[PDB]
Amino acid sequence: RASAQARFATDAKAAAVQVLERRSAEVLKSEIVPALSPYKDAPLDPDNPSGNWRSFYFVDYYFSCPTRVAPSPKQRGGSVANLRPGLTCSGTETIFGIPVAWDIRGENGILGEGVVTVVVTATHPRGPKVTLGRRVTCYDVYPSPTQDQPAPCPPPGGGRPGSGSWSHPQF
Amino acid sequence: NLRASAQARFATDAKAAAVQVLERRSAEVLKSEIVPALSPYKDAPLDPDNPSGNWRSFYFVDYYFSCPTRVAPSPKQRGGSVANLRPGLTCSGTETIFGIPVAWDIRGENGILGEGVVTVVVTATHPRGPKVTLGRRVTCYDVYPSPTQDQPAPCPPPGGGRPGSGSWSHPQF
């Protein structure tokens, strides 16, 4: 009985991992785009802005999820019109009959600047649940941001506005 | 483009190291052992009609109340005493996996939201650059056998977890 539950738990974890891996890879994806693309983030050659640029999906997920926020003028022209429209922030995948809830979101406030979390929960039909997360920062894309070339990191104060929370045991 | 390939491989390796450590530390949180009725670490009797028989002990309780600092449980769990939490657990540390340091931390969460929740968080930092941070959230409901109404262990009673730490966050600050 212990054995059977342990097997279901192992499977729930494997289902969780496969969704966490795929959704995290989306956050870290980049693409080469022309200088006319609204989704450009950094030029391949800083001395040739008329040439190709790299575009990081990190920026699209960070500012779109769970709700759309305009970036600072330093990223995507400060406009939500220049975030990719095709994206899904959350959902449920079924992996060998195991439902896995998943969510991608940017963090907010100064602490959340340039951070995206990916969180999954697999709920095995026979009981066991497994919840996994991955924390991705703007520094984790390739190539690495530098002082001179900060994208896809936002400038200070250029992330998602702080949502606010006041917790206390007295409450 | 060489560098891109190399860094992707190092990132894959960093992820594998993080997973290994996350699995080992999460398994520790979920571990149980059979103990006699006289054990200070007893949580639930194996037979609900025979408390004189053997008991199950959940390490979940030890990690939840010991990490990152030791807090006394409520009188319903471990006799309400830090003396009845297992000594010599490690809450945090660094493991090196094929030359990749992995920071790891187990802790109970606090306040009403944190009641009966333990997090396990790891960060693998590849010497050549790539970092990978993974977490697992474990609740008292995830042990085997599952807690029930008539047998809640290792879940604390309402108000019987780690006291809330407090945090006042606001963009005005």
Author numbering:
A (entry chain A): 32 to 202
B (entry chain B): 30 to 202
Task: List passages from the publication reporting this PDB structure.
Mutation of pilA1-3 and comZ leads to a loss of natural competence, although piliation is maintained.
Three competence-associated pilin genes, pilA1-pilA2-pilA3, are found adjacent to comZ in the T. thermophilus strain HB27 genome. PilA2 gave crystals with good diffraction qualities, and the structure was determined to 1.39-Å resolution; it forms a distinctly identifiable domain with a small subdomain insertion. PilA2 adopts a type IV pilin fold, a single α-helix packed against four antiparallel β-strands, with a small subdomain inserted between the end of the first α-helix and the beginning of the fourth β-strand, consisting of three short antiparallel β-strands and a short α-helix, linked by an extensive loop region. A search with DALI identified close structural homology with the type II secretion system pseudopilins EpsI from Vibrio vulnificus and GspI from E. coli, as well as the minor type IV pilin TTHA1218 from T. thermophilus HB8 (35). Although all three related pilin structures share the same fold, the subdomain is consistently absent. ComZ binds specifically to the competence-associated pilin PilA2. The ComZ/PilA2 complex eluted in a single peak (∼80 kDa), at a higher apparent mass than ComZ alone (∼60 kDa); the complex peak contained both proteins (lower). Specific binding of the two proteins was confirmed by isothermal titration calorimetry (ITC), which gave a stoichiometry of 1.1 and an equilibrium binding constant (Kd) of 0.69 μM. Our model for the ComZ/PilA2 complex underscores this point by locating PilA2 such that its smaller subdomain sits between the ComZ pilin and β-solenoid domains, suggesting that ComZ could effectively cap the end of the competence pilus fiber. Virtually no reduction in DNA mobility was recorded in the presence of PilA2 alone.
